Amino acid sequence: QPAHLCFRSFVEALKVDNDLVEINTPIDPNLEAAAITRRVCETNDKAPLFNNLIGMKNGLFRILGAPGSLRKSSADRYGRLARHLALPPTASMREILDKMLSASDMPPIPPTIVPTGPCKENSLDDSEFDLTELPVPLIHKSDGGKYIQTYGMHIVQSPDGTWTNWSIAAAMVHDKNHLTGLVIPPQHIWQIHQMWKKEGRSDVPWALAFGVPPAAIMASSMPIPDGVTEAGYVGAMTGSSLELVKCDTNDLYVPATSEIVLEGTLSISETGPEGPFGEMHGYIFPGDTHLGAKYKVNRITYRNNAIMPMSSCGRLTDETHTMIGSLAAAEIRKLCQQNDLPITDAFAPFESQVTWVALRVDTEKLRAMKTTSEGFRKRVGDVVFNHKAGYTIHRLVLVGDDIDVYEGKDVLWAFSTRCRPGMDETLFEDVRGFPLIPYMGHGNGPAHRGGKVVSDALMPTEYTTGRNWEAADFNQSYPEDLKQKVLDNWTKMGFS
Amino acid sequence: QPAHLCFRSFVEALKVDNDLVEINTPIDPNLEAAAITRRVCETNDKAPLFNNLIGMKNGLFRILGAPGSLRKSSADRYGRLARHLALPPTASMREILDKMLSASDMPPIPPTIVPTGPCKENSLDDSEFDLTELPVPLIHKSDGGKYIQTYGMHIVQSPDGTWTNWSIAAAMVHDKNHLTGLVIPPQHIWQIHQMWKKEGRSDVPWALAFGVPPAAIMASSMPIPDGVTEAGYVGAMTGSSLELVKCDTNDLYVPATSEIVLEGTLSISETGPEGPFGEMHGYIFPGDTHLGAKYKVNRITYRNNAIMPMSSCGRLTDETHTMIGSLAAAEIRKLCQQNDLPITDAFAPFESQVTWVALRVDTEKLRAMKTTSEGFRKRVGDVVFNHKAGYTIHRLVLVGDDIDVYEGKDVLWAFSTRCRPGMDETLFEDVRGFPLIPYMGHGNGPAHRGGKVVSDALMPTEYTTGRNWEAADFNQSYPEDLKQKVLDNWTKMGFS
Ligand SMILES: Cc1cc2c3c(c1C)C(C)(C)C[C@@H](O)N3c1c(nc(O)[nH]c1=O)N2C[C@H](O)[C@H](O)[C@H](O)COP(=O)(O)O
Ligand SMILES: Cc1cc2c3c(c1C)C(C)(C)C[C@@H](O)N3c1c(nc(O)[nH]c1=O)N2C[C@H](O)[C@H](O)[C@H](O)COP(=O)(O)O
Ligand SMILES: [K+]
Ligand SMILES: [K+]
Ligand SMILES: [Mn+2]
Ligand SMILES: [Mn+2]
């Protein structure tokens, strides 16, 4: 099976790329595996594969850390991500996001049911497993539980059967046969859970699949539209129907090659303690106490020599930056274009801790609109901040065509030099806010509302007659014939 | 003479450091010298010394570019700057700024008059020079003149004789015996020129000295207080009285070892075209047209084999970032402390194009103040934005003690995650603004007023009971004994 369609094949691909380190000596799931992975993420090192995890019971489990994190070189920086998608390892961010958006103008390709797969190689019933006995990691020293679920896919279906959602949401072990985790608006797991709670008759049939097809985990992390079944979007994106097996204890379908599958229910009534958890913005608030949703596990199925992927999330750079930020930005790009806004590109700068998105504007199109900053900012903010794709994003930065939004230094430059604080900005207080950002949930204002801004880093003539400056830089302040001479004589003269 | 007291000795020091490239083949002052220097600044390369400048007349002149720019290594990043000040080349930014502030609590050491010096080796009178015939650089392709003055020191004295100011302000060649340049509030050259215009009797006696003692050019770039003679501050800072010679045609005093000295007058009446000029924020607006102050040159004196320093300013990183930003930040630190604000450190992040200053707060002291964000922001902004040291700075970012303000990634992290847009900020519209920032002078609002903000990236408990988080990073989310094990086994395991 190809790497984008089978996690096991993805792990080989990383080895083959010289992008893996296999660690075959004993590693402790209490902090050590996550500390090594954290270090990898902070230094853009090779992904760690922990083949010898202290406490591995019943063949459960090895760990792969940093599955979607960065490589050190600029040339293949996003190569781990490209390997999720059958793209060359030198793919740009633009190319990766275009690939993730491509299925939005394609018919879905529904999945294919197969009678078995590797995820059925082993099983443990209700009398045989105990989640507290597995080598579930403690990821951060102050976490309130062992977060088994950082890179698996929750599978839930609407009561009417018409929408099956795949998404990533964190969850931790509660007891031998339950998890807890947050199920919060506007996320699709929450929208579906609300449908089941309004029906009132039963708990939500649920599965959590770990080590799924890489292309599937990418869609799981992207805010594709309400009502759209991820499996058919991934099928369209990859050009092939995904192979799924039925769960044993319910009628959901999981990827055939899933490394580990939990089957059970997500309660419509019960809650239990969750968190705190070290999170994407780089923080943990030890001691925070809160009741989350409760999941019951009835069955585990798994591959021989099963591998659990793990995100050791926090400060730059990990999956919560490379996937959450970038994939939101992609969806925001499309959303703006669909609302007739002249946006060509969008990216969530890592330097903003993926709380900003920079929107590159086609300024020829802007000029033909014959509008002003105050009107354009309001239009863009109304579109994005009232949509689920904007949920995680608190600052939008509008930039003209000279700025590469995929380059954080250029976004910073434009923001700092082209957007007058206050006057060039519109604040949005009556929109949903993201409580996870410390200034929101642990800040001075409402945790769930407001705190958003559109910052216009378009210059005045960009709305009227066109750009009226040149950069004071090597590229723009010197003619081509001189630049080339300089470059051709650089090492001759003594420079590096 | 030591490198910090003699420019010629500074150039040797750079060679000796392996921080110079001597270029002995012909280089064109029309763009080529500045293009090479621009490239150096954008890549943190060695300083270029152009020993063979096309059009060098009467021994005038060689050029040193990038005199105060960065080195490539992290270990001696600020070494060029350290060489201005007798500091080790590994000095930190903190150490450099402390050195620049040290004289603020010392008696001045007045200069010593000597009868001659190297700056008298050669002379050209009013019938012998022509500024349009010298190899003055064109620094950026769209500049409105050849900016002879980018790293010399203007010398002007109050009418009463009691204050002699040394400062850097750009100036360009107007004609064979005049320069033009901006003389604008609140700068000390402008405050002095206003005193002479109010007296109304004569033009301002003036000198411009190029290739001055490095410690002197540093003070020339720092906003030390009104009325304080830079020469006595530099004397105190260095521990020695600076040696000065009298000008021939007026009674001002110039450093004895100056490479090139212009003597003349700054008019109280006449103006002439100036600019446009590629500037510190990374822009030029070609065609901008404006009348600047006019300077008459009556005499040139110079060293044998005179060297003109040149700043090829623009996008990161050059003297306009390393000196203007950092030295303003230093003065702002002191100003805050003198106003009983608990600020321990200040720095202008390069990533903000030195338009922000990050202020590190002693949060134990803050807690004892028993105040709130809204009150503290207003207090800090009132102190800084109503003072000349705040002129160039449009955003202040308050951060707690865990943030290293000299590290732009950490400042960005704190700003993005701890300051709620709008609610955690106070806008200041009734303060002097810096028109040079594009969003000011080429923006949507008043060019000279407003556009400033204090952004509070202190978390709520930092005002009350203390920090209530830990970072989700390698340093803070793992115990010391584990961290050390990881580090000790890193290369063993296969990582880099
Ligand atoms: C890639 C990735 C995504 C997410 C998460 C993680 C990773 C690695 C964790 C490490 C587990 C940290 C966590 O905060 N986390 C997370 C989460 N969304 C949540 O509701 N809850 C979460 O706990 N997303 C984001 C969501 O996956 C996306 O917002 C997606 O759009 C949701 O799908 P849908 O609702 O649009 O179908
Ligand atoms: C280091 C340095 C400082 C300055 C400048 C440059 C360099 C290299 C130029 C390359 C020439 C670019 C230019 O914009 N420039 C510049 C300038 N101040 C001005 O009023 N005008 C200027 O044209 N400063 C800043 C001032 O030197 C400081 O603000 C100083 O504080 C002034 O001294 P004082 O008035 O406080 O005595
Ligand atoms: K999804
Ligand atoms: K000065
Ligand atoms: Mn969905
Ligand atoms: Mn001064």
Numbering used by the authors:
A (entry chain A), B (entry chain A): 4 to 499
From the paper:
The UbiD superfamily is composed of a wide variety of (de)carboxylases acting on aromatic, hetero-aromatic, and unsaturated aliphatic acids. Following binding of prFMNreduced and formation of holo-UbiD, the cofactor undergoes oxidation to form the catalytically relevant oxidized prFMN species.
The UV-visible spectra of one of the purified Arg173 variants, R173A, exhibits a modest 550-nm spectral feature that has previously been associated with the prFMNradical form of the cofactor. ESI-MS experiments using the R173A variant were able to detect MH+ cofactor masses of 525.16 and 526.16 Da, corresponding to the mature prFMNiminium and prFMNradical forms of the cofactor, respectively. In addition, a 541.16-Da species was also observed, which we attribute to prFMNiminium having undergone subsequent hydroxylation and further oxidation. The 1.19 Å crystal structure of R173A co-expressed with UbiX was obtained, revealing clear additional density on the prFMN C1′, confirming that hydroxylation readily occurred at that position. This suggests that the oxidative maturation of the cofactor did complete (before hydroxylation), albeit over long time scales. In addition, there is a minor movement of residues 184–187, resulting in Leu185 moving away from the active site. This indicates that oxidative maturation is affected in R173A, but can still occur.
